[PDB]
Amino acid sequence: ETPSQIVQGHNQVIHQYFDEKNTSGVLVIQTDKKINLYGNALSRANTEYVPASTFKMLNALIGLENQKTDINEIFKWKGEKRSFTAWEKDMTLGEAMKLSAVPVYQELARRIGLDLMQKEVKRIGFGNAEIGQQVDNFWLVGPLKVTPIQEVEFVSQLAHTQLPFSEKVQANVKNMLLLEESNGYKIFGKTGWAMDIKPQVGWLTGWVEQPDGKIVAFALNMEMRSEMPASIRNELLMKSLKQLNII
């Protein structure tokens, strides 16, 4: 009369984390040049999606490398009603990164210009590397698309200073992405939510630096719905990283 016991590994647990939210998601992990997939929708890992605000990482790299801006420049709020009151202030590229302040990065994208942007995106080989003709929204409503695996590869290269940009520019953009530090761990990353396409896509791409210096990169990608809190992406990421013993 001994009962059975259900054994939850991290694979089953992370799958069920997405099931509990009634949506499809994948979490891509990269460390030591090895990629592992978790979640309830593993086919998302090799599917192209619009990057949404994850593109701000590459926009910043391009703008700094081509000397269209600098890390101390204060981008002025010129008076239009923005999507959030928190965005209605003068701020640096780094503060706009943390706030995901789209209008600051639209101003930067327009300084870069369509020709230089398209050439730099193709030089990097980011996703499908197609930006179309609208310089101020190509990362929000297409035509630019990238897979979660491509995002984890990109962000791990950034973390290791391996992208084809100067070392100082990569270090500066990394500094804009710090989200949390505690107990010798650092978490860097960038959220994204393409709300104006269907299906909506949500992202959280970044990396953990562990106390011994090891880098564990991640790209979370999930289908969003309007009723979800934005923090759902952070919640799913943090619970999964803990289950994986990354933090």
Numbering used by the authors: 27 to 273
Give me lines lifted from the publication on this model.
The major cause of carbapenem resistance in this pathogen is the production of class D carbapenemases, enzymes that inactivate the last resort carbapenem antibiotics, thus significantly diminishing the available therapeutic options. The major difference in the mechanism of β-lactam antibiotic hydrolysis by the active-site serine enzymes is the use of different amino acid residues for deacylation of the acyl-enzyme intermediate (glutamate for class A, tyrosine for class C, and a carboxylated lysine for class D). Of these, the carbapenemase OXA-23 is by far the most common (~70%) in A. baumannii clinical isolates. In this study, we evaluated the interaction of OXA-23, the most widely disseminated class D carbapenemase in A. baumannii clinical isolates, with the atypically modified carbapenem, NA-1-157.
